[PDB]
């Protein structure tokens, strides 16, 4: 049983609740000098497509979606608690906006079949950017200036050097990818030493590496 | 200006740029009293909603829209009723 | 025997007993200057969806459930006991919500088969989450780009070493 | 404003931003005593309930 009247409205509760969703200007809100149960602005705080229906691990539950940025804050409401945490979450929200300032001159490259967003590419200057979904997540590989030259960086950045480290760290695994996120790294039998040997041939390519312990 | 209603009180005015003439009635003046600018010479008038200028021979009133002025001025006087069209613009200095 | 009239409803009760659920704005609660027993704010405080049937052991009893998030709550209530009991079940409570934040793009790569909820997989950077219920709990190994370099790091770090200690 | 209900009490109003007008009367003014702001160069309001 609360009731409020203004800007040609009568709205009168019994028995029962019911809240308001703002839109008001100039609402004034507490009559007989005591409040409502306590005024909220929604200016500092519940945050604007989503409700606090809230209850004992103080998540927001009833929330709606127009836009996929609301969809952003339709997330946000579920894996907020804590403050730290509906802080990040909160952040999350708008972070997981459009691309994040690449460069100025940003279009639309998507790749779509059937209405369905196919794969997201966005090529430009010292990065490729690959987001799919129906063969794994999202894959971004800088460059310098061409595709080429992100393999060469690779290539030199490559893991093969690191077999040093490992050989005093206890284990040799010894490791190493190729430019072209190629995958060459297996594994020996080697609970202390018991060689590293593999012989490929045929067409496909003949290369065999004999490693010894 | 008594309950809620108006008397009978009105806002509205025009201007005398004559050489020549008293001023003072009844020991209150018109409302102001001020000598001449000396006026425009490459400078104009931006009008917004409602604003309206006369001079050189141009009754130039726009109503509920804007409208600026492309200079082609001389001497043109600009301001009225103390206030601005919003800010004189000089096509000298800009 | 104990009673209480406003905001248009005379609830009387006698002989007996019938606490309230609140719902209740500006409810004035105490008359004859007495209590009803002692005034009990939901806000400092018998927890939403579960109330206190309480028993020797100090548990919960009743409660409802409406939704996942509610079930948790549900489920809170039973092994809480003593202060620190209840607080970490209490924490445990809200701690099972979604996926805590491993990203933002968050969609649900879920699979399932006729209604039931086969497996929950979730892949990304530094890795791969896959939680089960047919053939175990769950499993989540971190890589650092790709499932393979999710094996290298393993390789790395694997135990043929400690062999010497 | 006796007992319960409201004498005649009203709340409304309008503006004169007229020039030249004495503006009190019987001692009291208007309700206040405004020079102008001299408006708006590129402002607006919004508007909500």
Not at chain 1, 126 to 144: C, F, L, N, P
Not at chain 1, 167 to 191: I, V
Request: proline share 5%; with cysteine; net charge negative.
């Amino acid at each position: 049983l609360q009731n409020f009247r203004d800007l040609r409205g009568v709205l009168h509760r019994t028995g029962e609740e019911w809240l308001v969703t703002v839109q008001d200007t100039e609402a004034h809100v507490p009559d007989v000098y005591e409040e409502v149960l306590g005024v909220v602005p929604i200016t500092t705080l519940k945050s604007f497509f989503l409700q606090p229906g809230e209850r004992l691990e103080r998540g927001i539950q009833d929330v709606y979606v127009l836009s996929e940025q609301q969809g952003l804050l339709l997330k946000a409401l579920q894996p907020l608690e804590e403050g730290e945490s509906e802080e990040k979450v909160s952040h999350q929200a708008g972070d997981c906006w459009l691309i994040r300032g690449p460069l100025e001159y940003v279009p639309s490259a998507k790749v779509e079949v059937v209405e369905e967003r196919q794969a997201i590419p966005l090529d430009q200057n010292e990065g490729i950017y690959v987001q799919d979904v129906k063969t794994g997540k999202v894959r971004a590989v800088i460059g310098s200036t061409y595709m080429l030259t992100q393999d060469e960086v690779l290539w030199e950045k490559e893991l093969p050097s690191g077999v040093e480290e490992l050989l005093n760290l206890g284990h040799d695994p010894l490791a190493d990818r190729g430019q072209k996120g190629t995958a060459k790294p297996l594994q020996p039998s080697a609970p202390r030493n018991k060689t590293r040997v593999v012989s490929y041939r045929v067409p496909h390519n003949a290369a065999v590496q004999v490693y010894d312990y | 200006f008594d309950r809620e209603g108006k008397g009978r009180v009105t806002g509205e005015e025009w201007l005398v740029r004559s050489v020549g003439a008293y001023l003072p009635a009844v020991f209150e003046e018109v409302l102001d009293l001020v000598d001449a600018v000396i006026l425009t010479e490459k400078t104009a008038l931006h009008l917004r909603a409602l604003q309206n200028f006369r001079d050189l021979r141009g009754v130039l009133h726009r109503t509920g829209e804007e409208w600026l002025v492309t200079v082609q001025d001389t001497e043109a006087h600009v301001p009225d009723v103390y206030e601005e069209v919003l800010g004189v613009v000089p096509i000298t200095t800009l």
